[PDB]
Amino acid sequence: GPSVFLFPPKPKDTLMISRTPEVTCVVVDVSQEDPEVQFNWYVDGVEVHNAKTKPREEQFNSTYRVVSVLTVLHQDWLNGKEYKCKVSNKGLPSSIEKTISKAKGQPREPQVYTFPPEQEEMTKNQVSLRCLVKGFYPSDIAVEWESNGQPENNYKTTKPVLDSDGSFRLESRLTVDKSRWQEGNVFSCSVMHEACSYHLCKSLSLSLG
Amino acid sequence: IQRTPKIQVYSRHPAENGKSNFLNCYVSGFHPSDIEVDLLKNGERIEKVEHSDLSFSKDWSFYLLYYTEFTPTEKDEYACRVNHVTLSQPKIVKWDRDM
Amino acid sequence: HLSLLYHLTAVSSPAPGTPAFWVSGWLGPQQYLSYNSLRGEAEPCGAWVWENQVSWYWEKETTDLRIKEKLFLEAFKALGGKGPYTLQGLLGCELGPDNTSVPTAKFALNGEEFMNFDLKQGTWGGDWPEALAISQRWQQQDKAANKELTFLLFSCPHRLREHLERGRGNLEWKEPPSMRLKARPSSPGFSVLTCSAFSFYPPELQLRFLRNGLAAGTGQGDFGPNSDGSFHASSSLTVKSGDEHHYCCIVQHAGLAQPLRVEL
Ligand SMILES: *[C@@H]1O[C@H](CO[C@H]2O[C@@H](C)[C@@H](O)[C@@H](O)[C@@H]2O)[C@@H](O[C@@H]2O[C@H](CO)[C@@H](O[C@@H]3O[C@H](CO[C@H]4O[C@H](CO)[C@@H](O)[C@H](O)[C@@H]4O[C@@H]4O[C@H](CO)[C@@H](O)[C@H](O)[C@H]4NC(C)=O)[C@@H](O)[C@H](O[C@H]4O[C@H](CO)[C@@H](O)[C@H](O)[C@@H]4O[C@@H]4O[C@H](CO)[C@@H](O)[C@H](O)[C@H]4NC(C)=O)[C@@H]3O)[C@H](O)[C@H]2NC(C)=O)[C@H](O)[C@H]1NC(C)=O
């Protein structure tokens, strides 16, 4: 039986108007007996025809893969409209539907907290700058780091998880050279959220010290 | 976002054979602004074709009127050919006098 | 009542030999103004070419729209996000009863609203990072915001009220539509009834279908401009082939005292 997965747009794409937020409908386990996959897309139960399908790519496990990408209006996604991908194929009785959406609920602004390396952690190759983001709803959020403006490569960020008050929390750690932190470079945790003014949240920058 | 053109082809006055008139090709609801529009008589493109200003509607989508002075017959056919980044092939819409 | 709206468009990469920036100006549904960055001059369109108009009017329009041309093109510099850009503005006014005008100032990047101008405060606002960027670039300029305040709160309400005096006529224009109601075969046992309205103004028009006097509905509509400022509409309803003569088309229009019933 062929499997359908439906992915939401990257949060950053939905918070910047000059980026393309796209939903992504994916079919695996399509038999060579009969490909011929056919997509149907609905925004709030209404069909649209702007979707683009790539050609089916063969996988090394001798099945097929087929992806269909629909661009969404920034404000449709934020107003919480539903995106329904419906896949047709002669390896199923009837088609299968999957629906994806932004979550409904009163949006809450992130509370941001930055932390420098503790002094008792400073004869090591590199040092971590910690970033704690919580009190936000919904869970769509973008988190990156920058020094004196310029973006940064080395950072890991936890998935948003629900807290005991119905808001979401996560953490991000930037690893940096002990020298770059000692040379008094300025580091910032850049957070983007729906409920933030211009979608850009205020955080306090870190600099030793 | 990108939006595919809607294409309407209609005459300025009711189509009476032998009588001077205006053929219009209306292209609306499209984005971005770059678009190509040719009016076709018996399959070949017409030369003396004017057009209105690239303008846009409340939803920000662009629109444009192409038109030519002409005298329709009983056997002559007219169409409108449109290319736009959202179309992988030129789209022909043939003039129907009914509308 | 009636409105004066500038429709402005700048693209960061225009096609070869096409304006990077152009504007159409509208009094209700009629274009009175055309401007583009190639020509550099604001020009009247249609009957507004005949307007009993003051001698400097069209250089006030050129002056104001050159400022905006330069601003719109400055906006792209504030972005530096590689991929190409379209910036649109909907700017103007409509009169509110008792010597008052209600203003409009919206902006779209790549075809979506992202920014506005607040006439109460004198700032560019929006919910979007790219709104902050352009807003901020437009605020570090030679009196950009004061020019925008002036353009909307003084100039638009005057221009509008002066067109009501001098161009009253172009807008009270009433041309009722020429009508056709025709039948074509579609799928076997079925016909397309098509009701056509030709060269009418103003553009507000209601077409619907009757069957032996009874409401048969509005059909599927459609609507478009002509090259001469008139409009065009068709509505189609599928009927039983052999039932066609039981149907007639009712148009309603500002141009007609009483609704007009069209036979096949
Ligand atoms: C033949 O080969 C095929 C190709 O697979 C290959 O993968 C590559 C990467 C390599 O590893 C090689 O091994 C292969 O060549 C096989 O296809 C795969 O089949 C499996 C099983 O069906 C699919 O597994 C699912 O994966 C999703 C997450 O996938 C994302 O992340 C992957 C990287 O980690 C990546 O491979 C995927 O492509 C996909 O990437 C995303 O892509 C989009 C755009 O295209 C991006 O925008 C995203 O950013 C990107 N994401 C990331 C991250 O990178 C996973 O969600 C599925 O789990 C669901 O179902 C489980 C059971 O129900 C459950 O455990 C999960 O919780 C989840 O279920 C949902 O969970 C939420 C909880 O929050 C609930 O709310 C939902 O209700 C619930 N729903 C359901 C129904 O329960 C699952 O693990 C895999 O995606 C697919 N790979 C590709 C590629 O298409 C094929 O199976 C194989 N056959 C055989 C017999 O070998």
Quick one: C43 and C139 in the same domain?
yes
> For B12-46, b where at least 16 C-beta lie within 10 A, e where not — what string?
beebeeeeebbbbbbbbebbbbbbebbbbbeeeeb
Distance of alpha carbon C108 from the chain centroid: 16
Question: Nearest to residue C146, comparing CAs of C131, C164, C124, C166?
Answer: C124
Measured distance CA(C6)–CA(C27) in Å, rounded: 9
Residues C81 and C132 in one domain: yes
Phi, psi of C158 (to 5 degrees): -70, -60
Is C100 found in the same domain as C23? yes
- Helix or strand run (H / E) with residue A25: strand A22-30
Tell me whether residues C184 and B3 touch, CB distance under 8 A: no
SS3 A115: strand
Strands C205-211 and B21-30: unpaired
CB contact under 8 A, B56 and C9: yes
Chain breaks in chain A (C to N over 2.5 A) after: none
B-chain residues near A9 (CB < 8 A):
none
Nearest CA in chain B to A17: B1
Residues C25 and C106 in one domain: yes
Looking at the structure of chain C, the number of domains it has is: 2
Do C39 and C142 sit in the same domain of this protein? yes
* C216 shares a domain with C156: no
Closest CA–CA distance from residue B1 to any residue of chain A (Å):
7
Looking at this protein, which amino acid is placed at residue A93? P
CA distance C5 to C91: 6
* CB C36 within 8 Å of CB C21: yes
In 3-state terms chain A splits into helix, strand, coil percentages (rounded to 5) of 10, 45, 45
Name the residue with the closest Cα to ligand 1, atom 68.
Answer: A5
Yes or no, beta carbons of A71 and B4 under 8 Å apart: no
Spatial contact of C71 and C141, defined as CB atoms under 8 Å apart: yes
Which two structure tokens, joined as six digits, stand for B45? 């493109």
CA of C57 to the centre of ligand 1 (A): 65
Cα–Cα–Cα angle for A186, A191, A196, nearest 5°? 125
B97, C194 Cβ separation under 8 angstroms: no
| CA torsion through residues B13, B15, B21, B22, sign | positive
Residue with tokens 């930055």: A114
Q: How far apart are CA C208 and CA A200, in angstroms?
A: 51
3-state secondary structure at position C154 = helix
Give the residue from C61, C71, C25 showing the smallest Cα distance to C40. C61
Would an 8 Å CB–CB cutoff place C85 in contact with chain A? yes
Token reading at A15: 């918070």
Number of Cβ within 10 Å of residue B57's Cβ equals: 11
Taking a C-beta distance cutoff of 8 angstroms, is the pair C155, C60 a contact? yes
Residue B54 is nearest to which of C22, C225, C226, comparing CB atoms?
Answer: C22
From A71, A63, A163, select the one nearest A108 (Cα to Cα): A163
Residues C155 and C185 in one domain: no
Same domain for C166 and C179?
no
Q: Do A198 and C114 touch (CB under 8 A)?
A: no
d(Cα C4, Cα C29) in Å, to the nearest integer?
A: 9
Structure tokens at A9: 């747009």
Please indicate if any CB of chain B lies within 8 Å of the CB of C4.
no
Cα gap C252→C176, rounded to integer Å: 10
Task: Name which of C179, C144, C168 is nearest C73 in CA terms.
Answer: C144
Domain assignments of chain B as residue spans, ordered by start = 1-99
Distance between the two ends of chain A, CA-based, in angstroms?
60
Q: Which residues of C touch B65 (CB under 8 A)?
A: 224-227
Q: Whose CA is nearest to atom 70 of ligand 1?
A: A5
Q: N- to C-terminal Cα distance for chain C?
A: 37
Report the amino acid identity of residue B26.
Answer: Y
SS3 A12: helix
Closest to C112 in 3D by CA, of B82, A13, A106? A13
Task: Give the DSSP H/E element, type plus range, for residue C215.
Answer: strand C214-217
Give the angle A194-C139-C41 at the CA atoms, nearest 5°: 110
B1 contact A CB<8A: yes
User: Using CA atoms, how far apart are residues A94 and A83, in angstroms rounded to an integer?
Assistant: 20
CB contact under 8 A, A73 and B2: no
> What is the count of residue pairs from A and B with beta carbons less than 8 Å apart?
8
Q: Are residues C228 and C128 in the same domain?
A: no
**CA C227 – CA C235 distance, rounded (Å):** 21
Which residues have a Cβ under 8 Å from the Cβ of C229 and sit 6 or more positions away? C30, C31, C46, C47, C201
Does C211 lie in the same domain as C120? no
C160 token code pair = 């509008």
Q: Which two tokens stand for residue A102?
A: 């932004």
Residue spans of alpha helices (H) in chain A: 11-15, 74-78, 178-182
Q: Give, in order, the Cα–Cα distances in Å from A52 to each of A9, A69, A118, A186, C161.
A: 15, 5, 51, 43, 49
Among C125, C140, C172, give the residue marking a domain's end. Answer: C172
Spatial CB neighbours of C243, under 8 Å, sequence gap ≥ 6: C191, C211
> Whose Cα sits closest to atom 30 in ligand 1?
A7
For residue C160, what is the enclosing H or E element? helix C156-166
The subunits that touch chain A, with at least 3 C-beta pairs less than 8 Å apart, are B, C
Residue C202 and residue C90 in one domain: no
Give the method used: X-ray
Contacts of A29 (CB under 8 A, 6+ apart): A1, A2, A3, A63, A91
Q: Can you spell out the DSSP letters for C51-100?
A: ----TTHHHHHHHHHHHHHHHHHHHHHTT--SS--EEEEEEEEEEETTTE
Q: Any chain A CB within 8 A of the CB of C127?
A: yes
CA atoms within 13 A on the CB side of A117: 22
Domain that holds residue C207: 173-263
As beta bridge partners, residue C252 has C206
Please tell me the distance from the alpha carbon of residue A77 to that of residue A63, in angstroms, as a whole number: 33
Nearest CA to ligand 1 atom 58: A5
By C-alpha distance, which of A6, A4, A66 is closest to A32?
A: A66
Q: Which of C115, C149, C172 is the last residue of a domain?
A: C172
Pocket of ligand 1 (CB under 6 A): A 3, 5, 7, 24, 26, 28-29, 59, 61, 63, 65
Q: Which of A18, A41, A50, A54 to mutate to test binding with chain B, by most B CBs within 10 Å of its CB?
A: A50
* Nearest chain B CA: its distance from C147 CA (Å): 24
Contacts of C111 in chain B (CB under 8 A): 1-3, 31-32, 60-61
Q: Are C129 and C114 in contact (CB under 8 A)?
A: no
Of C79, C126, C127, the CB nearest to A18: C79
> Residue A207 corresponds to which tokens in the numbers above?
């600099």
- If asked whether residues C37 and C141 sit together in one domain, one would say yes
d(CA B70, CA A187): 69
Tokens 């209404």 appear where? A46
Rounded CA-CA distance A128/A131 in Å is 10
Chain B contact partners (≥3 CB pairs within 8 A): A, C
Is the CB of residue C66 less than 8 Å from the CB of residue C21? no
Alpha-carbon span A68 to B80, nearest angstrom: 30
Query: Which residues, including other chains, have CB under 8 Å from residue B97's CB and lie 6 or more apart?
Result: B11, B15, C182
Q: Return residues 40-99 of A near B (CB < 8 Å).
A: 49-50, 71, 73
Reported for C68-72, long-range contacts at CB under 8 A and 24+ positions apart, including other chains, are C68/C8, C68/C23, C68/C151, C69/C10, C69/C21, C69/C37, C71/C138, C71/C141, C71/C144, C72/C8, C72/C10, C72/C21
